[PDB]
Design an enzyme around this catalytic site. Sequence first.
Site, PDB file in Angstrom:
ATOM      1  N   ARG A 113      31.710  43.068  38.930  1.00 37.21           N
ATOM      2  CA  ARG A 113      31.513  41.656  38.689  1.00 37.21           C
ATOM      3  C   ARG A 113      32.840  40.908  38.863  1.00 37.21           C
ATOM      4  O   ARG A 113      33.780  41.053  38.057  1.00 37.21           O
ATOM      5  CB  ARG A 113      30.933  41.501  37.283  1.00 37.21           C
ATOM      6  CG  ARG A 113      30.721  40.110  36.817  1.00 37.21           C
ATOM      7  CD  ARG A 113      29.916  40.102  35.534  1.00 37.21           C
ATOM      8  NE  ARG A 113      29.724  38.746  34.988  1.00 37.21           N
ATOM      9  CZ  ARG A 113      30.579  38.138  34.176  1.00 37.21           C
ATOM     10  NH1 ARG A 113      31.715  38.732  33.798  1.00 37.21           N
ATOM     11  NH2 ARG A 113      30.311  36.926  33.734  1.00 37.21           N
ATOM     12  N   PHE A 144      38.159  33.069  38.022  1.00 38.31           N
ATOM     13  CA  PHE A 144      38.027  33.527  36.642  1.00 38.31           C
ATOM     14  C   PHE A 144      38.674  34.894  36.511  1.00 38.31           C
ATOM     15  O   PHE A 144      39.810  34.971  36.022  1.00 38.31           O
ATOM     16  CB  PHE A 144      36.542  33.528  36.277  1.00 38.31           C
ATOM     17  CG  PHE A 144      36.199  34.078  34.923  1.00 38.31           C
ATOM     18  CD1 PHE A 144      37.050  33.980  33.840  1.00 38.31           C
ATOM     19  CD2 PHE A 144      34.952  34.644  34.722  1.00 38.31           C
ATOM     20  CE1 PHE A 144      36.671  34.494  32.592  1.00 38.31           C
ATOM     21  CE2 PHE A 144      34.580  35.157  33.496  1.00 38.31           C
ATOM     22  CZ  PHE A 144      35.441  35.079  32.430  1.00 38.31           C
ATOM     23  N   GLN A 197      36.098  42.205  36.757  1.00 42.02           N
ATOM     24  CA  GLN A 197      35.703  43.093  35.678  1.00 42.02           C
ATOM     25  C   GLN A 197      35.270  44.430  36.218  1.00 42.02           C
ATOM     26  O   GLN A 197      34.459  44.487  37.117  1.00 42.02           O
ATOM     27  CB  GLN A 197      34.535  42.472  34.919  1.00 42.02           C
ATOM     28  CG  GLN A 197      33.824  43.421  33.957  1.00 42.02           C
ATOM     29  CD  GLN A 197      32.671  42.748  33.212  1.00 42.02           C
ATOM     30  OE1 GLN A 197      32.299  41.594  33.538  1.00 42.02           O
ATOM     31  NE2 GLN A 197      32.110  43.453  32.193  1.00 42.02           N
ATOM     32  N   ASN A 256      33.670  43.195  26.101  1.00 39.80           N
ATOM     33  CA  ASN A 256      32.964  43.713  24.931  1.00 39.80           C
ATOM     34  C   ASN A 256      31.522  43.187  24.869  1.00 39.80           C
ATOM     35  O   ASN A 256      31.093  42.450  25.735  1.00 39.80           O
ATOM     36  CB  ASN A 256      33.763  43.406  23.649  1.00 39.80           C
ATOM     37  CG  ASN A 256      33.934  41.917  23.401  1.00 39.80           C
ATOM     38  OD1 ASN A 256      32.947  41.189  23.410  1.00 39.80           O
ATOM     39  ND2 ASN A 256      35.183  41.462  23.154  1.00 39.80           N
ATOM     40  N   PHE A 288      38.813  43.514  32.095  1.00 45.10           N
ATOM     41  CA  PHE A 288      38.926  42.603  33.213  1.00 45.10           C
ATOM     42  C   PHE A 288      40.359  42.227  33.531  1.00 45.10           C
ATOM     43  O   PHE A 288      41.233  42.294  32.654  1.00 45.10           O
ATOM     44  CB  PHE A 288      38.057  41.366  32.994  1.00 45.10           C
ATOM     45  CG  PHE A 288      38.350  40.582  31.745  1.00 45.10           C
ATOM     46  CD1 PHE A 288      37.879  40.994  30.519  1.00 45.10           C
ATOM     47  CD2 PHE A 288      39.032  39.356  31.812  1.00 45.10           C
ATOM     48  CE1 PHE A 288      38.143  40.241  29.369  1.00 45.10           C
ATOM     49  CE2 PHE A 288      39.253  38.583  30.662  1.00 45.10           C
ATOM     50  CZ  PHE A 288      38.815  39.043  29.451  1.00 45.10           C
ATOM     51  N   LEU A 305      38.741  32.547  25.789  1.00 46.37           N
ATOM     52  CA  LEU A 305      38.467  33.894  25.324  1.00 46.37           C
ATOM     53  C   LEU A 305      39.449  34.441  24.262  1.00 46.37           C
ATOM     54  O   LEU A 305      39.251  35.554  23.738  1.00 46.37           O
ATOM     55  CB  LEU A 305      38.443  34.832  26.524  1.00 46.37           C
ATOM     56  CG  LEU A 305      37.401  34.500  27.603  1.00 46.37           C
ATOM     57  CD1 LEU A 305      37.607  35.469  28.752  1.00 46.37           C
ATOM     58  CD2 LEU A 305      35.997  34.568  27.041  1.00 46.37           C
ATOM     59  N   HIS A 335      38.564  38.560  22.845  1.00 44.21           N
ATOM     60  CA  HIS A 335      38.853  39.692  23.670  1.00 44.21           C
ATOM     61  C   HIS A 335      40.288  40.105  23.471  1.00 44.21           C
ATOM     62  O   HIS A 335      41.194  39.261  23.446  1.00 44.21           O
ATOM     63  CB  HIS A 335      38.568  39.296  25.088  1.00 44.21           C
ATOM     64  CG  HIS A 335      37.136  38.954  25.288  1.00 44.21           C
ATOM     65  ND1 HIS A 335      36.203  39.892  25.672  1.00 44.21           N
ATOM     66  CD2 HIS A 335      36.452  37.816  25.041  1.00 44.21           C
ATOM     67  CE1 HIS A 335      35.010  39.336  25.686  1.00 44.21           C
ATOM     68  NE2 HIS A 335      35.133  38.075  25.310  1.00 44.21           N
TER      69      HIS A 335
END
Lengths: 11, 163
Positions: B54, B59, B62, B101, B112, B121, B125
């Site tokens: 992904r 961004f 991952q 997670n 990621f 985030l 994370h």
Amino acid sequence: XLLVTAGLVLA
Amino acid sequence: VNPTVFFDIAVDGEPLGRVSFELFADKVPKTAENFRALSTGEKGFGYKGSCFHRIIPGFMCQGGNFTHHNGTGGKSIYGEKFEDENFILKHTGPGILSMANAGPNTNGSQFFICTAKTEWLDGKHVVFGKVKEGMNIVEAMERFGSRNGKTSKKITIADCGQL
């Protein structure tokens, strides 16, 4: 949206 | 002394180049150690052969999933999951290495690599490392992603270990 999850991926 | 690790990245099986990361063991030793051990493969499993499934341009990339007995999503070297160690480090910009997670205290193997500052985030994370060399590789990977995360070519960790 912009999340980094492992299984239930959301917007 | 913070350990360094490397991924050798491939695109549809073709080696593109190497990315290395500094792991912030001086701040989250348990989270850094999980990643190091999954990179060397020394427990009998880890990131080798794994894929970046992904990738969202703008961004992050991952990966870190692999199949294991007794559930799904990956496992850590401490078990199926482990605690959020702390949130001292923030998502400050491109290159940041942080744990994926499924909510609080569900860290495993997935992670990621940020391609932007991802402040939203922070606190959710655990940040634990940062690209050291080969950000050009991460930028090349990023072009193979899309808005919904699907990659147009298969991006894999052909090999990995410690430097």
